[model samples]
Target: APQQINDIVHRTITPLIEQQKIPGMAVAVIYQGKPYYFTWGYADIAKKQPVTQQTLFELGSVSKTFTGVLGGDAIARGEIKLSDPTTKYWPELTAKQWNGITLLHLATYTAGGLPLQVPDEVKSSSDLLRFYQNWQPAWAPGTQRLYANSSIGLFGALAVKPSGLSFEQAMQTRVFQPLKLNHTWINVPPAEEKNYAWGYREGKAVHVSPGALDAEAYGVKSTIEDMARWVQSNLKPLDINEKTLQQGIQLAQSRYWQTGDMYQGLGWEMLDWPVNPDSIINGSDNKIALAARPVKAITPPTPAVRASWVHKTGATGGFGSYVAFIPEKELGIVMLANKNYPNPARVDAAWQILNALQ
Candidate 1:
């Protein structure tokens, strides 16, 4: 497993490194329940630090997938329903804002048009509430895949309303601990702070700071090793003793809409098996996040299908990552980098490694 992974990963990653497009990368693969890992370049070029299995990289919107599973878990436990309107949890939100918007629409990023970023003017929680109260969608919910953070951010925040736990607390108690992750964290504690990777945005080092709804939006940090286990859990959720959690993981993969050939699930964007890299690239285009695109609703949302590639891509100003798994092959991968490179570059490298293995 190591040799094969090393060969393909090198062939796929070397060119990118040679071009100096990124500072460092960590790649992890899980095949038939077995795992392999590899790293390249420097976590910090000036410090000459290397990315290791233990090095923590920001997960960015990949955090949404966890939030997605949390929503699924809540729904599975009868704590919430996909069909529930936003006002069901936060009644302060006007009916006009929700209109036809539901929890599922938020989880799938289909709520009319929430901007990709929470407006900078929203400097406080109250500001965010007013922002929502004032929102009027140019497109109705379920008709367009707007691909924004505010909607899913709300999904994560409200997902824990019934339990009365903070978003990070709920995620820790339900998802991270249930999956037995030692390295994944929503808020990196002081002990692990030393292991965190320094994100180099065009050579300027930085890290995430508290922003409006960031905890519910793009706020997860993990190691390549932990991410592999996360995907493995998605591959076989039953591996853990938590049956409800297992069901939630499955629920997270349920397909609820179709846009072109792409499909939407909680936190995941999917493509039929035998997919080409171009489709994966297009499905991951950053433009969708910036603009609303139309979609067709699936009357009865479908269950997870094995013959498909389920994936998500995430990025912050200085970091980028991708996570994907093909159930039919019992295959999965996690790619992490300190530099936020192009989405296509991440997709292309992962495709080569996964393509070779399959």
Candidate 2:
């Protein structure tokens, strides 16, 4: 099965490797709950280091998936609630400017036009609060979707605030450790630092830098094996000993709003099961990521189920990643690389590999 899976992955990945000049890629697929792994190119081209299952690639915005689950898990544990006003989590947000935003808005990237990054001037945590206190919204909350890193960043940071744990520590205990994601971290311990993949941009290798909300937004560095495990864990969150954490995974993937054929969840974009690959491509266009789109509330919101196509794509300046899974079919794919490439290509490549498997 490994050979069979490798043949399919290579055909799809080899061309991408050349076209994008990817330094290294770690790809994994799980079908019927069994995972297959593959790697290509040098993790550190200058050092001639090859990729391995242990190699950690920055997850980029896909890290929001983790934050989403963290948010959902927090809600499940009674520390937060989706409908609670934003000020409830961080009283500092009680400023008039923050008046109508809620945890749901942050989880769904609808926090009244938050930008894709924390502004360059807002360097300190206090500055971040001031920015929110004085900021103006481009649109009313819950009416538009404008994907922003700080949306989920603030959500993660404040959602766990009542627990009195730093966002990193909350994730370490709530998500990573519970799932046995042995090598995932917002701050990779020094001992495991060597496995962190040095990513590339425009043919030169570099590493991702830290910024405000970087941890909650895109700070996760993990191996494809662990990513695959995460994908699989969502399929059966109950299989783990920590039942509430498992419940949070379900909540993170639940459908809360609709924009065209696409639906929004905590960290995943969702579509009813059996969606076409082209539709998945369409659902991920820049219109949804960079611009605001109208949305309709899901009313009571759908709970997690095994009949959905839920996934997310992520990238940093030097790294790129994509994850997709079909719980109904018990199939999923995770593609991680040390170079930021076109998001559509990752979706297409993953579709080919996944479709062939089923």
- Local accuracy of candidate 1 as per-residue lDDT tens digits, 1-358: 5688778888888897666578889888887778888898777677787888999998899998899888888887889988898888998887475867888888887888877788878898789889898888877778888888888998999889998999988899999997878899988999998788889886798898778889788999999888999999998876768777888888888889988777888887788888878888755767643556788888898888888889999988889999989988999999999988888777877888888998
Q: Relative to the true structure, how large is the alpha-carbon lDDT of every model?
A: 0.85, 0.87
Q: What lDDT tens digits, residue by residue, belong to model 2 across residues 54-115?
A: 99999998999999998888888998898999898778676676788998998888877888
Clashes of 1: 0
Q: After superposition, how far is residue 109 of candidate 1 from its true place, in Å?
A: 1.7
TM for candidate 1 is: 0.97
Query: How close is every model to the real structure, measured as TM-score?
Result: 0.97, 0.97
